[PDB]
């Protein structure tokens, strides 16, 4: 990548890594660090990327106000138009049939893979910064600069507003068993919540804004990305397990391999880095 990497995701078998960048591309990489494809078509910075559960479809989010759907070989399949400002994040439903997009226009939109707008989730009072599907597919979680996470059903009905962060919420993730919700915030914390909206834990330790959060596939490990240039690994009890050091600028996103053994981090230093659960740096994708 020729500019900041803004997001990273692992394919379902973890053999392919997808990276989003301000250079307006998504790049696809093998686990061994070889560049496989560069997906070209967005007209401004790409802000996030997601793999479909089948590993065949890639979704990308962009400042050009669209989501694009791509196949694993780089073909553009759909352009999802409807947001009135920058799209900041994207997620697939667990059945791969629905795409959720987050936008500076203060909404989440829901789309089918044919590109039809299914629903607009309205309620946030400021930019929406990230979106996640519950692993049962029945709930949508959104993160916002209005300092909240909101939970929604597919009907667009607001279910819960999770309040407590003292600054913008930058990202959101469901645990693989759907029992826990993690949120990242400019207030330098990750907070863990249950589905009732109750705060379970506040993870403290990062020295600057937290930009993204992810669960291991067994839900036992939480990874957080920060402007303090680290990824931190945490257990469910909130204990800090590791600090992954090596990026030379802000870390913007993080993801786990499907066996939870490898962590991918995205950075403004224009790289993706791969790490072991032990905290050891493994590889750097440039």
Numbering used by the authors: 1 to 286
What text appears in the publication on this structure?
β-Propeller proteins are common natural disc-like pseudo-symmetric proteins that contain multiple repeats (‘blades’) each consisting of a 4-stranded anti-parallel β-sheet. In the larger propellers a so-called “Velcro closure” is found, in which the N- and C-terminal β-strands are part of the same β-sheet, keeping the propeller closed. This “Velcro” can occur in different positions; in the “Velcro 1-3” variant, the closing β-sheet consists of one N-terminal and three C-terminal strands, while for the “Velcro 3-1” variant, the opposite is true. Starting from a highly repetitive β-propeller sequence, we designed a consensus motif sequence that formed a perfectly symmetric 7-bladed β-propeller.
All the WRAP-T permutants expressed well and could be purified easily. Solving the crystal structures revealed that they possess an identical structure. Interestingly, the different position of the chain termini had an influence on the preferred crystallisation conditions and crystal packing. While for previously designed symmetric proteins, the proteins typically packed in distinct symmetric ways reflecting the inherent six-, eight- or nine-fold symmetry of the proteins, here no clear symmetric interactions could be observed within the lattice. This may be expected given the incompatibility of seven-fold internal symmetry with any space group. Despite the non-equivalent positions of each blade within the crystal structures, the proteins proved to be perfectly symmetric, with a TM-score above 0.97 calculated by CE-symm. Analysing the thermal and chemical stability of the WRAP-T permutants revealed that nvWRAP-T, lacking the velcro closure, is just as stable as the variant v13WRAP-T. While v31WRAP-T is considerably more resistant to GdnHCl induced denaturation compared to the other proteins, its increased thermal stability is not that significant. A striking difference however is the stability of the “non-Velcro” variant, the least stable for Pizza but as stable as the natural “Velcro” position in WRAP-T. This may be due to differences between the sequences, as the two different “non-Velcro” variants of Pizza have different stabilities as well.
